[PDB]
Structures are given as structure tokens and as C-alpha cells.
Amino acid sequence: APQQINDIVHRTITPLIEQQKIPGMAVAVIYQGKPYYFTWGYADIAKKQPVTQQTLFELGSVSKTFTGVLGGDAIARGEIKLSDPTTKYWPELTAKQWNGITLLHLATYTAGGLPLQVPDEVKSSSDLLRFYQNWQPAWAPGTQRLYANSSIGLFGALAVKPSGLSFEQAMQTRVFQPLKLNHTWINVPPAEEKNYAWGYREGKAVHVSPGALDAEAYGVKSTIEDMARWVQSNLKPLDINEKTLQQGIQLAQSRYWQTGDMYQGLGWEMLDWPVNPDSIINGSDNKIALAARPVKAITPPTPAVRASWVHKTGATGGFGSYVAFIPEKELGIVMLANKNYPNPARVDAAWQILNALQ
């Protein structure tokens, strides 16, 4: 790597790893389009397996960016529209509260207070129907944003219905394969188990537990190399040769709602660059609370803004991930760790690195 990149990354990440007691970490910096990789520590402490460029990490909620793009691709294919009522694709959802709740609301956490998590008690698909039928919105559709797995999770499941593909088959065939993400998985195959890092929570080795709508909301596992390629793809969608996928990426970065300084896309979240680091790290957008926030509709949605800080944080019980990029600068970062450590620390490190290189 160029010495500037080497220096900025190591001087930022080394103290981070120390301060946060992170067992293993992989970092990719995309600079002028090209990827540079950095690894530290352990994928498996007990078996003394190092983190490599081939190590799989649980992305947690960074998975929502894949779901958002897959949904965008389905829009481009003419299979779904974000203006469609939810009931068009799940007509068994007959309870009145669903009148006026569209696929847009589901994708953008604006349905009226769908809960953060699907209850673990929800095990079957009749359990799932009951859950959504019985849910009572706190607010009218399109008035408040409440970050929710049960919201975008449902969007993902419904978005693939017309295709007749399972969510996993659709994601594999329409997103992973075309982008040559050959080591990115919703379900880790036995062949790849040697590469699957353990997460660490309170000193224990843990992997994500199965749950309803897990694939759609938090279920993807990936390598630092594939995640670098994912960032590249989202930085420059015009290089993508599959028409609907190029267009799906663009739709995922459209600005649908505004809360404070943040704009809600499909999976991706955006702020205008230059960004004041404070907001994302400290004020209202730092993600330590669970926050209900009134939204302003962007009517119509603003197409992908090049001068944006586009990002997504992600966690599982044992993993902490972060992705951020600035399209106008051809600049990006991926940080994958096998410990769930505070979001503000992620954002700070990412800003510190990207700011120095921009």
C-alpha cells in the first residue's frame, strides 16, 4: 500500500483494537477505486487461527444494504413498486392497520413503529402472519422512523415473491453472483467453515442464532475482499453490466426521508459530505439508544447524491461491522471485527481514516 494509507490505517486501528479489546479485525480501504487490505489478531482464539483476507465475518445489519439493493433490483425488473401496498404481496394481511402501509414504508422503517426485533417466540410462518396481523402501529404510516428488523426484514421477503425464488436464491443469483461475491453467504457452506470467524461476547465464542427474517435483516457473512468489492460496486454502479442491478444500486442510495442531518435510503443511510463527524458519532445518529424520530418525506426522492457520506453499521451478539463511502471521492472503508464494540468508535475511526485520505 501507499505509505499514507498504511500509516493512517495502522495509527487509527491499532489503538482502536487495544481500547476495545477486539480479538480480530479486517479493514479494507478503497482509494481511487483500488482496494488495500489490513488484518489483525484472531478469527478463532482457541484454535489460534489468524484473521486473513479470506476470513468470514457476520455483517449483522450491514446485510440490510444487500436487502435494499436486491429490492431495488426487483423494482428495476418491474416485479415490485415501492408505492405498492404491502397487501398486494401478502393479501392474507387483512387487518385494517395495514391499509396505506406500502413497500416503501417497510423498506425505510416508516410503517408506524414496527418493532426492532421479531420475537424469538415467532418460529413458524403462521407465527409470523399472526405477529404482523396483531401488531398495532403507534403512528400513521410515513410520519416516524423507527429502525426495525421486522420492517426491512418483511420488505426483503415480499420483494422476492414475484420472482418465485427464495430470498437466498434471489440474493445469490441477482446480487452475489453478478458482482463476483463468491465468498459471501446467507448460510455458510460446510466448505467455508474453516474460514468462519467466531464472534466473541463476554469472552465466549458465539455465532448468530437462527431467527425469523434473519437472512433479510441481519444474516449475511462475508470476507474483507468481497466487502471491498461491495463498496466498489456501490461507489460506481455504472461499471455494473447487469442493467437492473446497476439501477437497483442507484435506487438504494436515493433519499426517501430526512431526519435531522440523515437521509434514509434502501438499507444505506446518507449524509451530505462534508459531514460534521459529531452527528454520526455523538448527537442523535450514534445508535446507543433506540430512537423514534419524526421524518420529512422527500417528495419525490432525490437520486443518489455523489457528495454523500453513505454508510451502514452492523452488529450481531459477537460481531461489529461498519461500511462507509464517499462516491464523489472514489473513497471507502470496510471495518469487520469479531466483537460487538460501540458504534461511535467505528464511526470515529472511519472518519479519521477517510478524512485523512480525501
Ligand SMILES: CCc1c(C)[nH]n(-c2nnn[nH]2)c1=O
Ligand atoms: C439484529 C438483532 C440481533 C443482534 C444485535 N444480535 N443478534 C444475534 N446475535 N446472535 N444471535 N442473534 C440478533 O439477532
